Amino acid sequence: TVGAYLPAVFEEVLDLVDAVILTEKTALHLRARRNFRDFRGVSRRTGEEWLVTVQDTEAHVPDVHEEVLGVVPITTLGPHNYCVILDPVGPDGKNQLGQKRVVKGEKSFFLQPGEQLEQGIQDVYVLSEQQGLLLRALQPLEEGEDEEKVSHQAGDHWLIRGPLEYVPSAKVEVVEERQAIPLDENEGIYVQDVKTGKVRAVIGSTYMLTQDEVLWEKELPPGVEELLNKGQDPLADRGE
């Protein structure tokens, strides 16, 4: 009741609890001390924590039962941002412990009571044509967010390149940032397909290493390396 309140003979006044002002960038993280129903009308168990947002009330006042653990700032993600929620909230309202969920861009959301960010507001991997990604399916048959809906098995790598704004899923793991090596005609590298063991000479366009290729170091015999650096033109460099 707003105004000067006159306490009765039975009631002992301790203090005036101040209602906390909720903005769109903040929410109230509070637990429950006793079983009760809040002002929304949903019964809350003992020890259950939940969030009070602006969609519920513009100015909620920490109730006698509710223990305010602290305000929670909003976890806003830009269009070039993603984040990994540790222990997300499922459809039943309880935390799915041990699981993780990826959130895409442009989704301003609140960290639920138990949800944590894995590393914070990470940046989504945008890639050029000559840039790319080597991945590792931590689980089996992801077959998701793939253009060909190809399903990698657990532990095998694949290559994602080109103009793709790729966000690593909860199952996959980015191994290393891969860059295409610019090679013109009559120049190239020695790639080694470790899946089949063979080493080939790729010459032509700017080649980008696939999922199962590593650069092979050609070891020339000694003496030959001196004749390639020294003998640039033996028709003119011949006196020595």
Binding site: E185, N186, D233, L235, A236
Partner: protein
């Protein structure tokens, strides 16, 4: 004295009696040119020293 720009096309002004042969290694075509023309190297044309 001044260092040359590696980006720019290597051009050599051939005199009217001199002759330079350039080896276009990209297509394995050897051409030799003479006259007042300055020859311009391609991506892999090299002079005959």
């Amino acid at each position: 004295l001044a260092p040359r720009n590696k980006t720019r096309v290597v051009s050599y002004r051939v005199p009217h009696n001199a002759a330079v042969q350039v080896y276009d290694y990209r297509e394995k075509r050897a051409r030799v040119v003479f006259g007042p023309e300055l020859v311009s190297l391609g991506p892999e044309e090299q002079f005959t020293v």
